[PDB]
Nucleic acid binder design. Structure first.
Ligand SMILES: [Mg+2]
Ligand SMILES: [Mg+2]
Ligand SMILES: [Mg+2]
Ligand SMILES: [Mg+2]
Ligand SMILES: [Mg+2]
Ligand SMILES: [Mg+2]
Lengths: 294, 72, 169, 159
RNA sequence: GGUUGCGGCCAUAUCUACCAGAAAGCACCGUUUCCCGUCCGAUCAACUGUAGUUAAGCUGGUAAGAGCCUGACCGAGUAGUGUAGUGGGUGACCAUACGCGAAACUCAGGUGCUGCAAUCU
RNA sequence: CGGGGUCGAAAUGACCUUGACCUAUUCUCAAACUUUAAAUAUGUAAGAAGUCCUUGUUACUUAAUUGAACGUGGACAUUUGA
RNA sequence: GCUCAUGGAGAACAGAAAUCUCCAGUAGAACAAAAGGGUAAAAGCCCCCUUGAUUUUGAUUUUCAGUGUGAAUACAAACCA
RNA sequence: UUCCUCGUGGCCCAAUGGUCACGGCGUCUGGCUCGAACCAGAAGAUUCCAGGUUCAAGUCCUGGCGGGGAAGCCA
């Protein structure tokens, strides 16, 4: 009754594209990002796409074409266990490690890996990847955070920091990292270095084990199951950074199966369309029943 | 009515013809077509004009109206 | 079926629409401060009328928004005033409801004579889990009809809870 | 008084479209324009910067310059008894490649292929296009297609 | 073939009402010490992936469905129109000759296709 | 939940009258309305200043001998491009 | 960052219009003014920071004699937000 | 016909775009003394009509109506 739309409305209605309906893409931002200076004719503009789901971080290096965007390299958080991180796969430090991983990966496949080594001895400093003299002018890439809020302490900028320390030239200021004082507009490296390695998690683990233990049992459970203490958190991230810098070359999964074996069950399961003759018969039956004096 | 319109003609300028229409009243249908649609239940009177059944649309509504057509 | 389509209270909005600004509004704000533990928000006028005596952007009302167990606590404290009896008009077709009270000294705010006397317009917003699909930024969607709140659902909720009854119709 | 402004008489021309309002798809900005490319001009009304004058709507020109956001187009404009060359600095939203040149270059490479193919045996390619010739002789059968005789119909009112 | 991230064309993709949803994934979901933001940890931020649920979102299907798309010797070679005549007609206008050629209507059919990377009984 | 009468104490009460509003229909229209949309008029192109292959210059451009522009050298002639 | 006009359903004083909540809502609103175009995670509403409404001269489009003025466009070398 | 101006309580007249509108006369009530005059006090308005501009229109913008005024010349 009240929930009714007119044929005029639905005939005059112009749809948003598709990803605006799906609420996934700001085209006003994509315009500014992918649009290249027309005198750099086919020079591609490369986005570090950092996206956050529940239970996963996604980092991709993406260029644009008319038939669709194209990926150079991709790095997820569910493959960090290779390097030694099984817990906290969405935290600030896992974002840092994902950025470092995709940086070293794309540099390895491009040939910019022995030069532009990046920052090995982390210190919490604000420094951009500088160009070496008589050198290849490091790889340049711009953040695409998407519909995520630019906010101080947000963990998209942790991936940014990691990609910067890995050797990518990601243009950025330091006023969205943690440790940034608002009253005195400068940066504090100590809090940032603690965030890189999980001080904001280890401190909470300690302050919970000392105050409320049932919470420390329901969450931080896997740390107990696998013998990880608050102080054991810095070392595993420090070692994961080294393992990443050693072998970031994306060993994929074995897949356990083939595409056709995977598709057979889903096709068996998936509901299918109804033919035109079937539709006509389905309507004739309803005429003969509901209108044929039941 | 032919005489009433033949008298009206004098009030207008120009040439006006009087035509007997092959349709049923103010309808766009011929006489036998309207008759063979009213013998069945395609037709439904309104205050002055008439509504016709279509083979398009939802079937619940076309049975809520025009049941004489389906009661075959 | 019914795993997690339970009706929880999204929020409880307390509103006091004073026809004037100044000390009366400050005191009405100090009411809701002690009542909710939150800082209230004053709300402006949209346009002048010249009969009620309001200028545009003249700070005529004050309200506050409460969530969680505090909301149901204050709701119990107000239903005690209302004698656990509500009209059926007071329930909206979208599942939310509301009621007004006079003389907030019915609870909590005993007098503290520096404040005075004021009424409130309690309004209670009902929703089921999974309602941030409408509020979030990314992949914003609309809740399904089976999952929508309704008058017939929330009155049954309000009767099986608080063991209360509803008036005329 | 009279009125001859820049956007005079552009009401329906710089109208956007029916059910195609809003922003522009990204292919306009991902297309690539080099010097010498032939481009047609069709103004988008939602991008007020870099617009052409209404005279150049539906005009085809050649690119002479390329900048950050814009493209330099040469046009030929009839002014009295002669043509003058006109240089526009147009943003690319008002610009699309002409498909005529692509359809000509496909024919160019096809003719080259034919020439290389038939030079191996010398068979006089005759690569030029030709107009639609008159149709040749043929035979029409009445098997199952016997002529159906027709006649003019009388006059009826049909009202 | 399903799902996710990033997309291209931008309703064959939208809208209304129902139904169903292995696996994985997305999602809802749980908590507030820290960065951060709010009248409100509702939004935003951070932590956990642990306590639960496919209810919703999401995908698909259904509908003599609305809308949209395509086609047609459907209407209609109609209306309109370029050119021609010492053509008709008091005129208004209308026929004919050589050409071009619609829209509505009617009927029929369809209801997203696809690219890069990753992952899935 | 507009204005009237009747049963009426009134009622978030009823029977009727008239208006507005809603739904599906119906007749007729628009130089300064329009989904659609001609005919005639109009822009460009139909190759030697062209196409293709190879590799040279730059202080521009690129993550990069990657591109852009201009070039050397080589191949394709009178059906050389209606 | 948010979405408007308008309608509907509700909440003490509070009624046709005060403030609050929800649903629908392709723009039926607003964008200084005339009208016409254009615009929806904006070009609108609110908030933060600002002075690029800066310098140097040149080229182009419109009116057009391809003169001027006015207005506008896209660049260059700086300096800034 | 054109141009200018005005339209306000029963009458005459005024107003800063900024309280459902100043004054005076008339009317009504009471008083003084029978009535006037006089002393106190009250009531009375959809600012000609129809539209718009602004948070706000008596006023600000357009058209109509009615009242008044000026012009309507060379031949
Ligand atoms: Mg943004
Ligand atoms: Mg157009
Ligand atoms: Mg042509
Ligand atoms: Mg914005
Ligand atoms: Mg000039
Ligand atoms: Mg008296």
């Amino acid at each position: 009754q009240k929930d009714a739309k007119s044929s005029a409305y639905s005939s005059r209605f112009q749809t948003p594209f598709r990803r605006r309906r799906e609420g996934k893409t700001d085209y006003y931002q994509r315009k500014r990002l992918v649009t290249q200076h027309k005198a750099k004719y086919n020079t591609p503009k490369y986005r570090l796409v950092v996206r956050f789901t529940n239970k996963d971080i996604i980092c991709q290096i993406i260029s644009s074409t008319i038939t669709g965007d194209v990926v150079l390299a991709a790095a997820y958080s569910h493959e960090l266990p290779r390097y030694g991180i099984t817990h906290g796969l969405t935290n600030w430090a896992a974002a840092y490690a994902t950025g470092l991983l995709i940086a070293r990966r794309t540099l390895q496949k491009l040939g910019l890996d022995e030069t532009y080594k990046g920052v090995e001895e982390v210190e919490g400093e604000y420094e951009l990847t500088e160009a070496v003299e008589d050198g290849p002018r490091p790889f340049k890439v711009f953040l695409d955070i998407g519909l995520q809020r630019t906010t101080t302490g947000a963990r998209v900028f942790g991936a940014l920091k990691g990609a910067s320390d890995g050797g990518l030239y990601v243009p950025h200021s330091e006023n969205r990292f943690p440790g940034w004082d608002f009253e005195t507009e400068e940066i504090d490296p100590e809090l940032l270095r603690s965030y890189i390695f999980g001080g904001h998690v280890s401190q909470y683990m300690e302050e919970l084990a000392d105050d409320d233990e049932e919470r420390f049992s329901e969450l931080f459970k896997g740390y107990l199951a696998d013998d990880i203490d608050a102080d054991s958190l810095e070392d595993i991230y420090t070692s994961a950074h080294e393992a990443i810098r050693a072998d970031p070359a994306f060993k994929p999964t074995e897949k356990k199966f083939t595409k056709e074996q995977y598709a057979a069950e889903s096709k068996k399961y998936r509901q299918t369309k109804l033919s035109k003759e079937e539709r006509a018969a389905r309507v004739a039956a309803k005429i003969a029943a509901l209108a044929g004096q039941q | 009515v032919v005489e009433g319109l033949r008298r009206a003609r004098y009030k207008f300028p120009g040439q006006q013809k009087i035509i007997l229409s092959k349709k049923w009243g103010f309808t766009n249908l011929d006489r036998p077509e309207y008759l063979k649609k009213r013998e069945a239940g395609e037709v439904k009177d309104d205050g002055a004009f008439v509504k016709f059944l279509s083979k398009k649309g939802s079937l619940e509504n076309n049975i809520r109206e025009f049941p004489e057509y389906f009661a075959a | 079926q019914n795993p997690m389509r339970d009706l929880k209270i999204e929020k409880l909005v307390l509103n006091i629409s004073v026809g004037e600004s100044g000390d009366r509004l400050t005191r009405a704000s100090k009411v809701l401060e002690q009542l909710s533990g939150q800082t209230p928000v004053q709300s402006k006028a949209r346009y002048t009328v010249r009969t009620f005596g309001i200028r545009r952007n003249e700070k005529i009302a004050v309200h506050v928004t409460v969530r969680g167990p505090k909301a149901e606590e204050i709701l119990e404290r107000g239903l005690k005033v209302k004698e656990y009896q509500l009209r059926d008009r007071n329930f909206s077709a979208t599942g939310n409801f509301g009621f007004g009270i006079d003389e907030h000294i019915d609870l909590g705010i005993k007098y503290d004579p520096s404040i005075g006397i004021f009424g409130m317009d309690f309004y209670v917003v009902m929703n089921r889990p999974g309602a941030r699909v409408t509020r979030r930024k990314r992949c914003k969607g609309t809740v399904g009809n089976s999952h929508k709140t309704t008058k017939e659902d929330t009155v049954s909720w309000f009767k099986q809870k608080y063991d209360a009854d509803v008036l005329d119709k | 008084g009279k009125s001859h402004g820049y956007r005079s008489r552009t009401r329906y021309m710089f109208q956007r479209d029916f059910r195609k309002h809003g922003a522009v798809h990204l292919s306009t900005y991902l297309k690539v324009y080099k010097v010498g490319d032939i481009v047609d001009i069709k103004a988008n009304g939602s991008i007020q910067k870099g617009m052409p004058h209404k005279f150049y709507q539906g005009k085809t020109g050649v690119v002479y310059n390329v900048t950050k956001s814009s493209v330099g187009v040469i046009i030929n404009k009839m002014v009295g008894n002669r043509y003058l060359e006109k240089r526009l600095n147009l943003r690319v939203e008002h610009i699309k490649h002409s498909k005529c040149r692509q359809e000509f270059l496909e024919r160019v490479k096809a003719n080259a292929a034919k020439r290389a193919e038939a030079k191996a045996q010398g068979v006089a390619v005759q690569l030029k296009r030709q107009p639609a010739q008159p149709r040749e002789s043929r035979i029409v059968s009445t098997e199952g297609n016997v002529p159906q005789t027709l006649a003019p119909v009388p006059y009826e009112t049909f009202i």
